[PDB]
Design a protein around this ligand. Sequence first.
Ligand SMILES: Nc1ncnc2sc(-c3c(-c4ccccc4)ncn3CC3CCCCC3)nc12
Length: 289
Amino acid sequence: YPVLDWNDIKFQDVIGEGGQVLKARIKKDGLRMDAAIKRMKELEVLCKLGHHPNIINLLGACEHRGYLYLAIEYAPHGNLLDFLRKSRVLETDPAFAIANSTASTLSSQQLLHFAADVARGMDYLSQKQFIHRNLAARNILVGENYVAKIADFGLSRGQEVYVKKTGRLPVRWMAIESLNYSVYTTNSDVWSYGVLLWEIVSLGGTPYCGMTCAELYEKLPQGYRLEKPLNCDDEVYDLMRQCWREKPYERPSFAQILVSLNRMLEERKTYVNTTLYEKFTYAGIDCSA
Ligand SMILES: Nc1ncnc2sc(-c3c(-c4ccccc4)ncn3CC3CCCCC3)nc12
């Protein structure tokens, strides 16, 4: 749904590392478009769903010499985290940075729309009972027209899902119940989303720069939260803080989040500063992460 003919695929380049994925061009319903194709060895109807503008759409699937190749909507601009980081103009093009009084090629409004974008997608998923379990900047793709898209693959669907650990955990993104007990819910997804939001605001900062994974475990039950960024308005931070409430059911819903962003967007006020003025400080990326 649909079905792709092999003879319409023209592969262009490989993308990433390892599973095994490629950039193609497919023909679908008489139109030519970029796809990303992954080839699996040896669930798809629910994969649309993708019909939503912030969810990587499924384009086609196609059996060829014993394999199933899966074509999905192609994202021109990488994961959101890199995109954001490459936007750090003081570091990548300071002549530009100074001339234009700016710390990013991205604007506060644009930064928020990525937030809204993901917020919106999640809202639509969470209300169809899906649990992402991996919300993080690096896990969001920036798609055509710079519209942020979520990945719908391997999504647990249900009220709650327990997964046993053992690979690496996104500790810095996880909420406490997930930390304590390896359980994920939609409410666990919102916690992660606030870290995503925090990530966006820090133009790609590593959350909890300096702290180690051990330190976090001990300090989070303690009531410790990520520090409000120097470029961030108080309400934006406030919103992050709600996502990180200790009591899961206390946190907001994506609708609530989304409502609140949409308000912020409609105001003329800058909620996320990217303008140099007299001082500006990029959240650390390095650290021992
Ligand atoms: N649509 C795309 N356009 C650009 N590049 C890529 S890389 C990619 C991908 C796939 C994949 C899965 C199915 C088909 C094709 C690719 N499996 C892991 N990834 C990498 C992950 C990156 C972070 C967010 C989750 C996906 N999909 C895209």
